[PDB]
A paper describes a structure:
There were two protomers (MolA and MolB) in the asymmetric unit. To understand the fused form instead of the separated enzyme at the molecular level, we determined the crystal structure of HpMsrABC44S/C318S at 2.2 Å, which showed that a linker region (Hpiloop, 193–205) between two domains interacted with each HpMsrA or HpMsrB domain via three salt bridges (E193-K107, D197-R103, and K200-D339). We found two acetate molecules in the active site pocket, which was used as the crystallization buffer (0.1 M sodium acetate). In the active site of the HpMsrA domain, the carboxyl group of the acetate ion interacted with Oδ1 of E85 (2.50 Å), OH of Y75 (2.60 Å), OH of Y125 (2.79 Å), and Oδ of S44 (2.93 Å).
Methionine sulfoxide reductase (Msr) is a family of enzymes that reduces oxidized methionine and plays an important role in the survival of bacteria under oxidative stress conditions. MsrA and MsrB exist in a fusion protein form (MsrAB) in some pathogenic bacteria, such as Helicobacter pylori (Hp), Streptococcus pneumoniae, and Treponema denticola.
Numbering used by the authors: 34 to 357
């Protein structure tokens, strides 16, 4: 069925508009949560002690509560008390309010993970929803009605891909010796480089996703692939900012930047600053031997269905940008 979670994260105008853009969110509405009364209004907030919140109805088949929270973490200061941006006050406190007992454990785990990486003392409170009142219809869909309205957060973050670092694992070195070809092993494990113009993917122009051949972790979208003329698969950026790592490479009497996968720590290739201007200028020059391409039609079967709308939206954007 459909599930609900209530999120207080400062300005509810931008928050509501943000959550609405997340894939899996059926509806987002503005409101007032966990105050001292059973009903209030926008200029009785300071007395009712309600927090400006967003009621988020989501499809648990399409997005989990855990990933939904991690989208929410991207647009709030998790350590500040009663303040987000320039909005000061108790109605701007951060909080997560649940109506299902089983949601408490998920929320608590997500906050500890968030804390374990951004550090500090997480100020986000966690309580069951006690009393709630839907905001005035003047406040509903506010940024749709006022495209120049106040919005402190970056709504583009809602289009970013989140890749779970715990659903892909690197098999043992002994398993990789049987699962990978000789070439794939040397490239990914010993930093060799396959031959340019003689590898499977450098000239592939097909919609889908490229994953770490050693772990299955998503790495690159077909929407960011382009023809570099260099003979290796070339991308303008990874599928998000978390899946690849960067390291100095001083071999071959050159100085270069090696790119590696986050989970598998596999050698992928290198990143250069000679990519096409209109795509950002970077060239991620990746070995086919480090990648496994999964076409759009196959992504659901292979366990990557939650990334399909992201590949397709990327390919629509590439399609339109071509039309200039």
């Amino acid at each position: 069925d459909e599930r609900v979670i209530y999120l207080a994260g400062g300005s509810f105008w931008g928050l509501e508009a943000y959550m609405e853009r997340i894939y899996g969110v059926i509806d987002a509405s503005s409101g007032y949560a966990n105050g001292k009364t059973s009903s209030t209004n926008y200029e009785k907030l300071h007395e009712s002690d309600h927090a400006e919140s967003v009621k988020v109805i989501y499809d648990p088949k399409k997005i989990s509560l855990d990933k939904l929270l991690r989208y929410y973490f991207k647009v709030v200061d998790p350590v500040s008390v009663n303040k987000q941006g320039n909005d000061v006050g108790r109605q701007y406190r951060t909080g997560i309010y649940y109506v299902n007992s089983a949601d408490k454990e998920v929320i608590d785990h997500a906050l500890k993970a968030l804390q374990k990486e951004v550090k500090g003392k997480i100020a986000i409170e966690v309580e069951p929803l006690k009393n709630y009142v839907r905001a005035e219809e003047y406040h509903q869909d506010y940024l749709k009605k006022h495209p120049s309205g106040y919005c402190h957060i970056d709504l583009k973050k809602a289009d970013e891909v989140i890749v779970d670092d715990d659903k892909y694992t690197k098999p043992s070195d002994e398993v990789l010796k049987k699962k990978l070809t000789k070439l794939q092993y040397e490239v990914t494990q010993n930093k060799h480089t396959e031959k340019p113009f003689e590898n499977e993917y450098y000239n592939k122009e097909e919609e889908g996703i490229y994953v770490d051949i050693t772990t299955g972790e998503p790495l690159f979208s077909s929407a960011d692939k382009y023809d570099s003329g260099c003979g290796w698969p070339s991308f303008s950026k990874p599928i998000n900012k978390d899946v690849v790592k960067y390291e100095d490479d001083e071999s071959l009497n050159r100085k270069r930047i090696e790119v590696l996968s986050r989970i598998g720590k596999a050698h992928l290739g290198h990143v250069f600053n000679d990519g096409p201007k209109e795509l950002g200028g970077l060239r991620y020059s990746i070995n086919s031997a480090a990648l496994r391409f999964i076409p759009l039609k196959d992504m659901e079967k292979e366990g990557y269905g939650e990334f399909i709308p992201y590949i397709k939206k990327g390919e629509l954007k590439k399609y339109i940008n071509d039309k200039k």
